[PDB]
Amino acid sequence: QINLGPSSNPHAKPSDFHFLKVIGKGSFGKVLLARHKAEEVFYAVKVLQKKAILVLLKNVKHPFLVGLHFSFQTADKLYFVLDYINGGELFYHLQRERCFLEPRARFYAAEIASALGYLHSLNIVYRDLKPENILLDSQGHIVLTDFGLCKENIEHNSTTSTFCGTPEYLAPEVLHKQPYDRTVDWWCLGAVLYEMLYGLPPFYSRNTAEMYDNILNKPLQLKPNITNSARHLLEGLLQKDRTKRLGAKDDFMEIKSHVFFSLINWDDLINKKITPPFNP
Ligand SMILES: O=C(O)Cc1ccc(-c2c[nH]c3ncc(-c4ccc5ccccc5c4)cc23)cc1
Fold first, then answer.
1. Which CATH superfamily is domain 89-278 in?
2. How many angstroms is it from 271 CA to the middle of ligand 1?
3. Which CATH code for domain 7-88?
4. Is 117 annotated as a binding residue?
5. Contact by Cβ (8 Å): 189, 201
6. How far, in Å, CA of 102 to CA of 109, rounded?
């Protein structure tokens, strides 16, 4: 038996679920579309094998983090019942539109920002924010797929391909392989916003090794057609030196109070009062 925390359900079994189709295979297992036999509703169920593991689960609730309903385990597998977020991946919409308008992009960046800031206040670092970790809900609000699995305890192939790697934003410090502090999430935020405005990740290249080389050595070139506030924020968030990066000295308060997010009422944002610019 593995300790799963307060969300643990000693009664729940795989026999309670009707699995329909595979949702998505990640680094830490597989996610499947399942309909509860009794309750008659749809859940995204993440399954991870117990032989893959070498104080493991710490679920955090937030209007912009996916909700963990309960968790259960068999002799071989672990199950994590999550909200089925149906609005589709944010970056699917991005591809279909080539890029986002600034008010649109700000909205999404702001919702992600708040969730990251809240986690840091509880001494939790997101570590590896990816476009595949960002979804919109039925209404059009940002939902992050991370629910609290201790990632530094799961055996998985992190092997990187030569051309056309898995979309991910590796900060300069992560490439040097230095411990994750909060400021790594701010780089990821900046990279998410960069891609939202420009259509591709910062320092992008078809060659993965060339891409890493850019991240480390090539100066951040921001093309025109974005506002000064957007320009200044990206310059701040995509600082290669993490002691100079925006949100180094005062974390979320540096992002929250930035001129780019002037139009954001953060109280209304968490309370989902600002209606999403796009409805799925
Ligand atoms: O597996 C990993 O490591 C990382 C990871 C990835 C995803 C999720 C995830 C939790 N809940 C979810 N609900 C829905 C979806 C989802 C996916 C594709 C869709 C395509 C079209 C329309 C709706 C779609 C919905 C994905 C999740 C959790 C962990």
1. Transferase(Phosphotransferase) domain 1 (1.10.510.10)
2. 24
3. 3.30.200.20
4. no
5. no
6. 10
